[PDB]
Write a protein that binds this ligand. Structure first.
Ligand SMILES: CCCCCCCC/C=C/CCCCCCCCOC(=O)[C@H](O)CO
Ligand SMILES: CCCCCCCC/C=C\CCCCCCCCOC(=O)[C@H](O)CO
Ligand SMILES: CCCCCCCC/C=C\CCCCCCCCOC(=O)[C@H](O)CO
Ligand SMILES: CCCCCCCC/C=C\CCCCCCCCOC(=O)[C@H](O)CO
Ligand SMILES: CCCCCCCC/C=C\CCCCCCCCOC(=O)[C@H](O)CO
Ligand SMILES: CCCCCCCC/C=C\CCCCCCCCOC(=O)[C@H](O)CO
Ligand SMILES: CCCCCCCC/C=C\CCCCCCCCOC(=O)[C@H](O)CO
Ligand SMILES: *C/C=C(C)/C=C/C=C(C)/C=C/C1=C(C)CCCC1(C)C
Length: 229
């Protein structure tokens, strides 16, 4: 039954990508890169979901678990881009914040890639230590987001600060759910079926990408505030 959720994920990301590509044509000036980044987030996710939906995004591991690894290839590209969207909202001049941005992105890539490594690992003890390492990097991401970007965004215009805060809270809430789903799904304890796991990630993905992107790209006042500068 997981095929159903993968096809819904595909169509949802596809429709989001097409809509975001459309909104670009009326983007406030100097803001078109937001629309491009956000349509790439959903577009990459659409490709991953199509791959998994057509049966090419998973392998049966030596322990017999079916492992949807294409999921993580999506994530390793799109979660940095989501953070990038948040950085470009919050930071008035990102060219002077290379060290922070590279640090945030590197932590995020370590999180995803160590989670993929944990998921692919059959040895139960190696899987646990790798999940902890991944969660450690995740805490790094949340910390940089909360300690640095919330402060930066408070110096932006009221509309920019408002959409940043909305997207950042949305991000923190949704991203915390992903390790929980991992832990109850087949990669972790197997408390729920693979079909349930795939459904949960599909709902999270659509909210964290299409919901995120709808809120971002509809905030035309905030965008124009940034574009005008
Ligand atoms: C300036 C940057 C500094 C960064 C410092 C990082 C320090 C943290 C690293 C710790 C090493 C952890 C090794 C054990 C986990 C890997 C098991 C792997 O297990 C497996 O792959 C399977 O169990 C094999 O069957
Ligand atoms: C919005 C970002 C992009 C998201 C993806 C949307 C575009 C999807 C494009 C094509 C779908 C059909 C693919 C056919 C491939 C044929 C290769 C060879 O095929 C075959 O071998 C035959 O199936 C025979 O079995
Ligand atoms: C897969 C782990 C990749 C880690 C990559 C490094 C992330 C943290 C680096 C930040 C750059 C700091 C400034 C360096 C300037 C001097 C070299 C020019
Ligand atoms: C189930 C009740 C006990 C708590 C389990 C919660 C978290 C465990 C996290 C450690 C890593 C697990 C790797 C599989
Ligand atoms: C597997 C579940 C993972 C849940 C992650 C929750 C992380 C919360 C931990 C530490 C808070 C980090 C932010 C501190 C901000 C200080 C300014
Ligand atoms: C079961 C998943 C629960 C997720 C809970 C997320 C709690 C944190 C929410 C918003 C944090 C806002 C921080 C502002 C500085
Ligand atoms: C989105 C938030 C969580 C929705 C609840 C999932 C229910 C699965 C319900 O799953 C079911 O009904 C299956 O039969 C369980 O095997
Ligand atoms: C569009 C996709 C998104 C926003 C995916 C987010 C994924 C995560 C925040 C993943 C977190 C993980 C851990 C913190 C521990 C190991 C397992 C992961 C990779 C699910």
């Amino acid at each position: 039954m997981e095929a159903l959720w993968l096809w819904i994920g595909f169509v949802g990301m596809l429709l989001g990508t097409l809509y975001f590509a459309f909104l670009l044509t009326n983007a406030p000036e100097g803001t078109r890169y937001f629309f491009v980044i956000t349509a790439t987030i959903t577009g990459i996710a659409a490709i991953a979901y199509l791959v998994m939906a057509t049966g090419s995004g998973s392998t049966v591991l030596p322990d017999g678990r079916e492992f949807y690894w294409a999921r993580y290839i999506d994530w390793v590209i799109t979660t940095p881009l989501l953070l990038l969207d948040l950085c470009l909202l919050a930071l008035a001049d990102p060219r002077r914040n290379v060290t922070f941005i590279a640090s945030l992105i590197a932590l995020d890539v370590v999180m995803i890639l160590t989670g993929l490594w944990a998921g692919a690992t059959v040895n139960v003890a190696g899987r646990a230590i790798l999940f902890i390492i991944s969660t450690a990097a995740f805490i790094g991401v949340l910390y940089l987001l909360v300690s640095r970007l919330f402060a930066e965004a408070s110096r932006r215009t009221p509309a920019v600060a408002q959409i940043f805060r909305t997207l950042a809270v949305l991000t923190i809430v949704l991203w915390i759910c992903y390790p929980i789903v991992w832990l109850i799904g087949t990669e972790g304890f197997g408390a729920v079926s693979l079909s349930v796991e795939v459904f949960l990630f599909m709902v999270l993905d659509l909210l964290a990408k299409v919901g995120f992107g709808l809120l971002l790209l509809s905030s035309r006042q905030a965008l124009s505030d940034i574009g005008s500068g």
